[PDB]
Design a protein around this ligand. Structure first.
Ligand SMILES: NC(=O)C1=CN([C@@H]2O[C@H](COP(=O)(O)OP(=O)(O)OC[C@H]3O[C@@H](n4cnc5c(N)ncnc54)[C@H](OP(=O)(O)O)[C@@H]3O)[C@@H](O)[C@H]2O)C=CC1
Ligand SMILES: NC(=O)C1=CN([C@@H]2O[C@H](COP(=O)(O)OP(=O)(O)OC[C@H]3O[C@@H](n4cnc5c(N)ncnc54)[C@H](OP(=O)(O)O)[C@@H]3O)[C@@H](O)[C@H]2O)C=CC1
Ligand SMILES: [Mg+2]
Lengths: 480, 476, 476, 476
């Protein structure tokens, strides 16, 4: 350990640091103390950033692929150099257990490395257009042109890697961008910005501007932005789509992800239980694909329940700086009170707490319930905390229907060795991604990732983000 | 035309009323009457589309293909009927109407081919030790019920660019054609009704814009795909709610004639006259602005004035007619007013200029200021403007001097200039050695800036009408 | 059958002689006589193919498609003629002959679709400062004249897998069908002669192997694509010279029945009988070896013995015949000799076993030693061997215990076992939940080890029948 | 250079002997001595490769990438050592030796990128009712042990174009470098020996052609990939047996200068001189023939004569040297004999023309008859021929007037002419606005006609070093 968190941070306006004020206090989410103060961007700074992004469109578009790759490679190298600094910043400002903070910094590097690879292979097509006599002598050629200035909004819980899934493809694609990180967790994004400020990018290629939601209207409504890409809560995301105007909108939202445990899993129950506990309680359940609902075949239910109760009770809660901590604080006392209120309501309606259940401020222990009615808020809304619900099924198709019994559809997991059941799940689960033999909580950063129903609109993963951040431009050549 | 047409509700002909009168756009007389859908019928169609989602999703690729092949065969069989219906209800010259029916067949044939090759990917996910043992598999799943809205000017082929990919992708859909030209869509519906598609796979429902709110707002639709005016399309995007939105809109397309074109001027002029005046300029990629290098401007002008004056205006049923009626006297009046204002501000009519009701002759102007409505707004009529340039980059800048960006054309033999145009023209498509008005129905097609959001062409519409669904398999 | 057939030399029928007698493979009587091409005719065909290279290359994609579509339509109209000819000259049961004609049509249909989507790539080449300003563009150019050799058992469809992609790719070709079954190829040629292909686009020339050296050695062919026995194919590769060589050969295909299959044994047994005995085992992916988990062996054995005994042997013109004659008495003698040797070494015939001329009953043995010719060589007749395993990995190793590697089948519901089989089976294709005998005509298809070199299936044949041609453009 | 180098047998350095002397190609003195592999060592290497097939196949993609990344990092650290070794053993001017080390790194970097994206396809197989319920999944499986042979002139980068894709694809390989230039390959081997690759993943074995039969004939190799002279490559294809063969050979590359190039002549002349005389013309895409439009022939000739005469010849250790020694006096004598014959038949030397041992001046000739050896065979030395044309199609015909077809270059700004050249030049690659001598290491690269069979460039080499393995899954 060597402490590198600064007492103050600037924001980044058109690639350069501005120590405009110290008005945004960032707390340590475990101690509650102010850990650092960062510059808060007002609407004039946001407007200036957008104008600079417009001016950077042509210089960014003209940057050759290998230069964009070199920028991304510089980031990769510097993130590796500053690995412990990034991990500690994440631990402090998100209250994220240090082991898992280190894991997210590894993902940040992974995401930029995928972007570095994809930056030099944004290919096009030579299209046969001679499909009829009228088109004799015509040929098509395609390319992907950067869409223009992009507006990026990211959430508190994976602040490094979810910013990376917008920033890194934008650089690969050649788009200027303005990123607004979560005000509770801005420091990681500002370290990313400091690293980018070391590169030769054209001025206006990027701004990173902390701003509260109530001062952030221009990120959605300014017509100079050609894309809004938002990662955050469904309630916010769908509201911003309505206000976005002409720009393209990409939404990465939330859900109440389910895992199914099939009848053939007896011999690997310890593996299953370990992955269920990871998915339900990693980062205290503050994951957009955290396991919230667990559907277990009746033949295995009692044995799995005993094992999962024991595993859940074994998880260490406490200071996220402690490398033995698995369950750190929830992001605020108000979020803990929201979830504990839903838990109380489920219990009042007949549910039973079978592991955990103690809440002390933002310290919510890993908690497991059964007999939760499907009508309950704890069942149907996004828990976003260290609570999971255990339920029983007989017929695989009933398990699938109950996974789908939701407003949401981000990912689902199925522990099965049956080809028939895996195929049926792929056919029938209305989700962005179906995970076989692991929890829905799995993501690798090159894969297409996103939700359907109320959980999203579009996909991230570097290739898919590049597609959204570019416009195809066809050239038709006529030969006579 | 038949005396009356039904609408199609969940694959079924319903003779609900005869309330929508469709006029012959040349004679002005009522040519047919068709059933007008009310909100109850639209709601029932949407509910039926929801119930058809699973049966459509389960329809095998080769059966979706067979449905598309049946349409192709019947459109060939009914070619003259379709072309004459187009001629009547759109006032479209019969030669151009036949051209559109040929394209209707082309569009469905591309869809037939694409229906059986909606492939996915086996993705390497082992990019780090954490992901050892994981593999990805992808497929495209139908997005769900689709809402389709189409315009008056290509009533068969632009409906086809939504209907045919929806069938290939496995989506139920509800199509609202233009009230001025609904018969083509209703003949497409009649042919689809012959097939064994599951009930609720399709509805085709005439409705006026003021009775069509549910096509935009109903949350059971997962996609709205709109083809029509920019003013309407951007307004509907604001009201669509959660659904995906695809927009195919309009523009003021330009053609550049480079300094190396002197020996090809007769070809260039023929294509300019085609692009500016085909279907009386009622094309979303009609040539509206012509930028010509100063070195050959005067020769091109003489030839283009002569060509424009040679174009025959009159009854669209006459095969010799090139310029038929505009869609209404009010649209002709709108364009004539813009022309008058440009002349009042200093422009000069150098060919044509006579307007009589909806009969607007092929017209060419010079000295149109770039601030004029005739320059900047979508003319959608048989008027083109001619202007001069010296430097190629100035021509490119002036093409881009617009709210719009659908397609642009560049007549050049210079690799350097073609490459520069591809780099710099902010449009969906750049056409080299033909006008921007060229489209072949498999190509990616659409606009940027105020001209659109997304692409049509069968492959690209299938992408919008499906959701990727990843399956990650972990081996331990 | 007509009394005589011509051969086709540079698109035209030539009734050169009646020197090749084609027998009815069930009655033994001469059914027709066809013209036999000598080396002078083969040489002339090659020269004509060279002269047709440029006109074939300049044929637009939609014209190549139209040629293929004409074949599809005419094969449909001549369906019964084609099936009856195949039934007579191959002794193929009429139901399976009709099934092959359907495949012939489907193979040409896939080629028709692919003919208009032979796309290329726009490649980013700016991977370093040295390559700043360079871009790559690719296309596929026809490779040139192609030499095609096809076998007796699927004479229509295996010719189609060379002819149809050649037409889609723009290659002139010269096809030598099997002398035992040349008529189907000559009907295909007659249909092609109705199209307006440039003269020299195709020749179809019956010739015996000992008069066929030019098909391998002539340097004017740029590709030899051979479907036939491994002994011949590997020997032709050695003699081919500079040309590209594609080989589609044979094997001793295996099916594994996993421990989880008890509830679907009737399905498994039905597919095993189909794969082992369809066309009397005269299939390059016929089931020859059946490995069954010990826990299910006795139940499957009883069901498979009963199923095998139920198969009707006899006249292939009878639609109830499943087991028709083998292609000749000499081939029946070959297989009967291997069967006798296996029994002498301890094997047991548990169903069938009677041989009378070319009429070889559907036959099942157990206790066949892995050293036996019946185990290790290509049976190509209505014999299958049944063996037992305990460990899934042992089953996989025993599938691989072979010179060959075309396809293998695994009946399993285990993801773990399906994945392991995909990892470990050294074959071109692994079929899960069906026999190795399955093929659909768009899929990549071929062998590794001694079973082949390269892949057919339309897309993959087009790749072999074309050369990529890169255009690098430098901007500075 | 070190005093001695070992060879690498199954990943390990073996100082077996010092029997292969490597000379400094400028001084002629022995610069180092390396271990020469005999048949026993080659056979041991092949057996070890066979044993490494399964461990190499099971290496996860990210581990193969890490191996490649280790190579990139160490090549950067050892950049000067690699460049000096190449300068000495090939006589390659130090500036250009440094350039080839940069290419070595670039080639491994492309391979590192491609190693983690060897994706497959999820194929729709439901193209007919018979195939209802079937789906296809593909993967690329390493082909097995690969035999690699590389030439003297780009010994680092051409070894890299085999070694790096083999590692990305998961194939064990045995590489035989050119005996005249083995040190660079042995440094690559030393770096690979630092990685944790399974034993038998690689061997690098110097051996003379007369002791190298097993590299072509041993049946345990599944692929021979040969880069070298056409006379050798086509001969090895005849002897290869069943294995797949890939050939990267030579040619007599041409550059066309079109009529529109007057304002660019200094750029054109600089690139022509570079392409003709880089590494003293010892390049498989060196410019040998220069076709110039009559309208600017005299001006180009004057400029190219002056540029050619300005090139500095001498010690390749001097950074100012561009024309170093040819690889041997025997090769110099070969080319000077062809030059003498051309002059005796009427050609004129207009620049250079003098030869002193292996020091052959940059030399330009006119009036070389198309029949001459200097015109038609591969010069592989610092000689270029200048000729005149009036019609672009005639220039294209004359480029094609050759046994060869690797790459051609065309300096033109005409879209029409660039398209015609892409249509008509029978070469692997057409370069627009640069010489045929351009290559970037990700692009598809290779020859047609006598110049090659197949393509290198990382993606394309991976395709040849893998077999597709289809998994068909049936759902009922
Ligand atoms: N990008 C493309 O592919 C093309 C685009 N176009 C564009 O189409 C326009 C010309 O067509 P036009 O028919 O006049 O266009 P409109 O925008 O006037 O109408 C198009 C369609 O939208 C419907 N519509 C209009 N307002 C609403 C509303 N509030 N809610 C629901 N539906 C509504 C119309 O209904 P109704 O008329 O029945 O009331 C009609 O079906 C031009 O701008 C042209 O560029 C044309 C061809 C090609
Ligand atoms: N991979 C695949 O797609 C398939 C492969 N096969 C394989 O085909 C074989 C059965 O067919 P079959 O006809 O008996 O095979 P053969 O190898 O006996 O004959 C195949 C073709 O090759 C010709 N031929 C044989 N020797 C030569 C030669 N020296 N030069 C030129 N041509 C020659 C034959 O001519 P002719 O007979 O006229 O003398 C015939 O046209 C089996 O091994 C089977 O596995 C079958 C079907 C599918
Ligand atoms: Mg600290």
């Amino acid at each position: 350990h060597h402490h590198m968190l600064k007492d103050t941070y600037p924001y980044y306006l058109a690639n350069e640091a501005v120590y405009a004020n110290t008005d945004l206090e960032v707390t340590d989410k475990f101690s509650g103390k102010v850990a650092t103060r960062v510059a808060l961007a007002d609407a004039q700074a946001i407007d200036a950033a957008i104008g600079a992004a417009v001016d950077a469109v042509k210089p960014m578009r003209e940057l050759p692929a290998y230069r964009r790759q070199a920028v991304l490679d510089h980031c990769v190298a510097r993130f590796r150099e500053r690995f412990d600094e990034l991990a500690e910043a994440l631990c402090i400002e998100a209250g994220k257990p240090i082991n898992d903070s280190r894991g997210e910094v590894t993902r940040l590097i992974d995401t930029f490395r995928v972007a570095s690879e994809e930056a030099v292979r944004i290919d096009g097509e030579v299209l046969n257009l001679e499909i009829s006599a009228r088109a004799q002598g015509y040929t098509g050629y395609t390319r992907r042109v950067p869409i223009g200035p992009c507006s990026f909004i990211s959430p508190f819980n994976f602040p490094l890697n979810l910013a990376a899934h917008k920033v890194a493809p934008a650089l690969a694609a050649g788009c200027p961008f303005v990123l607004k990180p979560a005000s509770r967790t801005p420091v990681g994004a500002l370290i990313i910005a400091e690293v980018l400020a070391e590169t030769n990018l054209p001025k206006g290629a990027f701004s990173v501007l902390p701003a509260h939601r109530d001062g952030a209207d221009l990120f959605t409504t300014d017509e100079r932005f050609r894309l809004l890409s938002f990662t955050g809560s469904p309630a916010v995301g769908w509201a911003l789509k309505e206000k976005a105007g002409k720009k393209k909108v990409v939404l990465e939202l939330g859900g109440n992800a389910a895992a199914i445990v099939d009848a053939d899993q007896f011999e690997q129950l310890d593996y299953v239980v370990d992955r269920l506990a990871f998915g339900a309680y990693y980062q205290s359940g503050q994951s957009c694909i955290g396991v919230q609902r667990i559907l277990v075949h009746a033949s295995l239910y009692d044995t799995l329940r005993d094992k999962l109760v024991a595993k859940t009770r074994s998880l260490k809660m406490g200071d996220p700086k402690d490398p033995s901590t698995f369950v750190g604080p929830m992001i605020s006392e108000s979020e803990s009170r929201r979830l504990s209120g839903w838990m109380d309501a489920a219990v009042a309606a007949g549910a039973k707490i079978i592991a955990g259940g103690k809440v002390d401020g933002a310290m919510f222990e890993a908690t497991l319930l059964e007999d939760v009615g499907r009508e309950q808020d704890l069942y149907r809304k996004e828990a976003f905390g260290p609570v999971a619900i255990l339920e029983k099924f007989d017929r695989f198709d009933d398990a699938l229907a109950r996974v789908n019994d939701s407003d949401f559809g981000l990912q689902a997991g199925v522990f099965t060795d049956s080809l028939t059941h895996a195929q049926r799940a792929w056919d029938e689960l209305e989700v962005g991604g179906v995970v076989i033999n692991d929890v829905p909580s799995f993501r690798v950063d090159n894969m297409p990732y996103g939700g359907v129903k109320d959980s999203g609109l579009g996909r991230e993963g570097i290739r898919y983000a590049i597609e959204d951040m570019t416009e195809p431009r066809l050239m038709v050549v006529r030969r006579r």
